[PDB]
């Protein structure tokens, strides 16, 4: 009797390759291909939460690197002046604070990370990582995220009080009603 498997007995078995951004590797190895991978993983579309949002185009694994919050690192004491300059030119300001003395300015050289909306029940979180003496802000998935789902994280604004309150439209059952 003939057997289709007789020639396969010694062959390498194949399966789906796991993306480096998703694997249990040191950060620099995961980060190396984040830019290319992110362009495949996510896109900017109209959102039911607010204006435009970032959405999943292709399943994202739990704990995988989604996208870097790209921009130029500046000192914390430059922000105010920069905000006034942009405001005076009709330019939308986008920044993400790294620590007390450093901030990422995504206004002029940012990417799609700028469009991530807030949610009181998020599916993403963020981390600061150092690669080659350079600080980067990286967004990770808290859970498996599926094609079509909106990516959100918790802005966790310091609780203002009055008035001063900005309403939240995240639509989560556990919504806090205000962004602050």
């Amino acid at each position: 009797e003939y057997n289709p498997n007789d020639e396969e007995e010694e062959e390498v078995q194949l399966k789906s390759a796991r993306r480096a951004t998703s694997m249990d590797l040191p950060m620099p190895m995961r980060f190396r291909h984040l830019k290319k991978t992110s362009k495949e993983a996510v896109g900017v579309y109209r959102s039911p939460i607010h204006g435009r949002g970032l959405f999943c185009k292709r399943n994202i694994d739990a704990g995988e690197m989604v996208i870097e919050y790209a921009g130029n690192v500046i000192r914390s004491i430059q922000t105010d002046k920069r905000e006034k300059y942009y405001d005076s030119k009709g330019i939308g300001c986008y920044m993400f604070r790294i620590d007390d003395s450093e901030v990422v300015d995504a206004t002029m050289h940012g990417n799609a990370a700028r469009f991530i909306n807030h949610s009181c029940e998020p599916n993403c979180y963020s981390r600061v990582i150092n690669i080659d003496g350079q600080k980067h802000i990286v967004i990770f998935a808290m859970r498996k995220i599926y094609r079509g789902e909106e990516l959100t994280y918790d802005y966790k604004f310091p609780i203002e009080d009055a008035s001063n309150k900005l309403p939240c439209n995240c639509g989560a059952k556990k919504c806090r009603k205000f962004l602050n």
């Binding site: 993400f96 604070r97 620590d99 963020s126 918790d154 802005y155 966790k156």
Partner: peptide, 8 residues
């Protein structure tokens, strides 16, 4: 509004 650091 500059996204905060306590975010991390």
């Amino acid at each position: 509004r500059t996204k905060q650091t306590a975010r991390y």
